[PDB]
Amino acid sequence: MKDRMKTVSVALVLCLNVGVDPPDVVKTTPCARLECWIDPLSMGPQKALETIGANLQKQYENWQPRARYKQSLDPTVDEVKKLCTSLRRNAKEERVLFHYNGHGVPRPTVNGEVWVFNKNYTQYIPLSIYDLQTWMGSPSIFVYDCSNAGLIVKSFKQFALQREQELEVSMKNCIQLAACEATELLPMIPDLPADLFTSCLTTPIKIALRWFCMQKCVSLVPGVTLDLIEK
Amino acid sequence: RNFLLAERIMRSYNCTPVSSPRLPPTYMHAMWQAWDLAVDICLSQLPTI
Amino acid sequence: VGRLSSMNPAFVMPFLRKMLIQILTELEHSGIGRIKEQSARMLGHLVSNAPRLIRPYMEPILKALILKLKDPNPGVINNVLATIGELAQVSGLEMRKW
Amino acid sequence: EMLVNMGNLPLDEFYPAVSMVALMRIFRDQSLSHHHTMVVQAITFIFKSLGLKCVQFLPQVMPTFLNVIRVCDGAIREFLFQQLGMLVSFVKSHIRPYMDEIVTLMREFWVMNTSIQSTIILLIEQIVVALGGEFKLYLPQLIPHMLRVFMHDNSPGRIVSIKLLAAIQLFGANLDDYLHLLLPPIVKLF
Amino acid sequence: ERNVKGMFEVLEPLHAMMERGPQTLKETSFNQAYGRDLMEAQEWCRKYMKSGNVKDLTQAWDLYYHVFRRISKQLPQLTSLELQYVSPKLLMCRDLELAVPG
């Protein structure tokens, strides 16, 4: 076997605007709240926004530490440009890891865009996704933890087809993982970690056990509780 | 590898997560029941351990 | 399959386990005589044919059987009685509580 | 309470809020046995006109409405279930905590009767699209009415069973454990 | 020039009364989240207490200024506190041999 392009680094464009409800949503008291098994509501608000970024990196380091990490907190287009282009410039043929979360940030647009500027008010911003399409034109991977990720993937095909409609003068080798299909919207059952797709891609065992213990309707082993599968 | 585990839980709920390449479905496969037996065997003991 | 359970466990064992939960669910939520009766029959029929499989989680089977005895064609109670008989015969010392 | 209530508020909210409070005193009384349609349809129209902005009235309205339904005279209680349906499709996930009682009413009042059958066979689908995954906790409470009537519906061509044959298609993943119970009655029918 | 009143009297007894007390009968590690930088300033303070070397003084103070500046941003924005994290024996007593407080 020949090819050994490893990974460059993880973008961790952790767009959360902690505590600010993206006005699309209405919660309920029984709310899905946890992310990377931390609750920000019961923690130091603007401080804890750093902690989760380091936590997520340390989980990815279990799956591979021989590649880098920038913890990118509510970044505006300029911040995004700096993050992605600097890392890509260090190694071009190597795999970049695009990773995102769509929190304190409304649903993605029909044309694949985002909602952050100077952490002002969940501020609409064009994501420069059709430029990212050459920043990621050489090998990369993408993860989209958001309420309509299949829309991001579909629109990525429409922009990639617009790249073809120039290239007529690597369409997408690069990997993509979508937390739901375009039509869907994420669950709100409080028994779920909120970053569920990431939480699976990052900590499958905790998920599997915490899923498992709820599912059946007579517990053929009856002694088990949440409390023990922690231990 | 974790993506297949995701496909299971997501189809438990109302999600159908999707991939760059055009994968065939997996959620049904008999080997999953081998997983679930292995967990039950394990967690039969843990209430004493 | 009850018999072959000692030979090639990797295919057989899990498959059987899936049946067991499906049959307890049926026994728990069936409203019909015919299905309740067949449920209890198939359970009883299985236990002694692959006994090693029931040892590890007898107790909720037994609790369900008690609750079927406790409150009502008598054929359903007859099959549950026959099943207690087989179960105790397999179980041995484990039985002492009930 | 009005001078307190008015004394607290920006204008917009106190219009529907005073409308709600005004109606709720009648809602708590036997005179409702006359004005039922009026009060109920008024609520419906107000919730319809508000969406996100009537969730705040659930804690008063809903437990009162359940008490009304379980007290109500059958020939108009039949009608209340349609109204509860439309209240649910406005309210969505926020219905959660009452669901135990709502399912209990559907347990208590389901028999060979055509109008109860057809209205409840509809009502289900609102509960389903509100509880798109969650509904499973309640499905086993309802399998015991479904299996019976699926194989005893006296109507010409088992017509409410033909409506149930569509209704079943909604359930998708949340049906998954119980397919083993539900399939064979369909196989006999075709 | 009234040196004793601040550094000697307050600052080592302070850190000793973090190290027993809230490093045990409160959640050790997160109370030690301040305590572990208060500790590195405390070493320089303990050096100064006995030495009288005016370098140990300015080291102790600058380190203390840094953790003080961390603390200065967080005293303004703690508000509601989980009672067993307030003390792990607190919250946990129930249905007592006591009438309600006087």
Swiss-Prot record, chain B:
Record PTM: O-GlcNAcylated by OGT upon glucose sufficiency, promoting interaction with small GTPases Rag (RagA/RRAGA, RagB/RRAGB, RagC/RRAGC and/or RagD/RRAGD) and subsequent recruitment of mTORC1 to lysosomal membranes, leading to activation of the mTORC1 complex.
Compartments reported by the entry: Lysosome membrane; Cytoplasm; Cytoplasmic granule
Tissues expressed in: Highly expressed in skeletal muscle, and in a lesser extent in brain, lung, small intestine, kidney and placenta.
Source species, domain of life: Eukaryota
Subunit relationships: Part of the mechanistic target of rapamycin complex 1 (mTORC1) which contains MTOR, MLST8 and RPTOR. mTORC1 associates with AKT1S1/PRAS40, which inhibits its activity. mTORC1 associates with DEPTOR, which regulates its activity. mTORC1 binds to and is inhibited by FKBP12-rapamycin. Forms a complex with MTOR under both leucine-rich and -poor conditions. Interacts with (via TOS motifs) EIF4EBP1 and RPS6KB1; interaction is independent of its association with MTOR.
Family of this protein: Belongs to the WD repeat RAPTOR family.
Function field: Component of the mechanistic target of rapamycin complex 1 (mTORC1), an evolutionarily conserved central nutrient sensor that stimulates anabolic reactions and macromolecule biosynthesis to promote cellular biomass generation and growth. In response to nutrients, growth factors or amino acids, mTORC1 is recruited to the lysosome membrane and promotes protein, lipid and nucleotide synthesis by phosphorylating several substrates, such as ribosomal protein S6 kinase (RPS6KB1 and RPS6KB2) and EIF4EBP1 (4E-BP1).
Protein name per UniProt: Regulatory-associated protein of mTOR
Gene: RPTOR
Included stretch of the parent chain: 348 to 396 of 1335
From Swiss-Prot, chain C:
Subcellular location: Lysosome membrane; Endoplasmic reticulum membrane; Golgi apparatus membrane; Cell membrane
Subunit structure: Part of the mechanistic target of rapamycin complex 1 (mTORC1) which contains MTOR, MLST8 and RPTOR. The mTORC1 complex is a 1 Md obligate dimer of two stoichiometric heterotetramers with overall dimensions of 290 A x 210 A x 135 A. It has a rhomboid shape and a central cavity, the dimeric interfaces are formed by interlocking interactions between the two MTOR and the two RPTOR subunits.
Disease: Smith-Kingsmore syndrome: An autosomal dominant syndrome characterized by intellectual disability, macrocephaly, seizures, umbilical hernia, and facial dysmorphic features.
Top-level taxon in the UniProt lineage: Eukaryota
Gene: MTOR
Organism of origin: Homo sapiens (Human)
Family: Belongs to the PI3/PI4-kinase family.
Post-translational modification comment from the UniProt entry: Autophosphorylates when part of mTORC1 or mTORC2. Phosphorylation in the kinase domain modulates the interactions of MTOR with RPTOR and AKT1S1/PRAS40 and leads to increased intrinsic mTORC1 kinase activity.
Purpose: Serine/threonine protein kinase which is a central regulator of cellular metabolism, growth and survival in response to hormones, growth factors, nutrients, energy and stress signals. MTOR directly or indirectly regulates the phosphorylation of at least 800 proteins. Functions as part of 2 structurally and functionally distinct signaling complexes mTORC1 and mTORC2 (mTOR complex 1 and 2).
HEAT repeat extents: 13-52, 55-93
Transmembrane segments: none
Protein name: Serine/threonine-protein kinase mTOR
Domain notes: The kinase domain (PI3K/PI4K) is intrinsically active but has a highly restricted catalytic center.
Tissues in which the protein is found: Expressed in numerous tissues, with highest levels in testis.
From Swiss-Prot, chain D:
Modification after translation: Autophosphorylates when part of mTORC1 or mTORC2. Phosphorylation in the kinase domain modulates the interactions of MTOR with RPTOR and AKT1S1/PRAS40 and leads to increased intrinsic mTORC1 kinase activity.
Subcellular location field: Lysosome membrane; Endoplasmic reticulum membrane; Golgi apparatus membrane; Cell membrane
Start and stop residues of the HEAT repeats: 11-56, 57-95, 97-136, 137-173
Expression tissues: Expressed in numerous tissues, with highest levels in testis.
Entry domain remark: The kinase domain (PI3K/PI4K) is intrinsically active but has a highly restricted catalytic center.
Task performed by this protein: Serine/threonine protein kinase which is a central regulator of cellular metabolism, growth and survival in response to hormones, growth factors, nutrients, energy and stress signals. MTOR directly or indirectly regulates the phosphorylation of at least 800 proteins. Functions as part of 2 structurally and functionally distinct signaling complexes mTORC1 and mTORC2 (mTOR complex 1 and 2).
Family named by the database record: Belongs to the PI3/PI4-kinase family.
Subunit-level organization: Part of the mechanistic target of rapamycin complex 1 (mTORC1) which contains MTOR, MLST8 and RPTOR. The mTORC1 complex is a 1 Md obligate dimer of two stoichiometric heterotetramers with overall dimensions of 290 A x 210 A x 135 A. It has a rhomboid shape and a central cavity, the dimeric interfaces are formed by interlocking interactions between the two MTOR and the two RPTOR subunits.
UniProt disease link: Smith-Kingsmore syndrome: An autosomal dominant syndrome characterized by intellectual disability, macrocephaly, seizures, umbilical hernia, and facial dysmorphic features.
Name of the molecule in the record: Serine/threonine-protein kinase mTOR
Gene (name only): MTOR
Parent sequence residues shown: 933 to 1122 of 2549
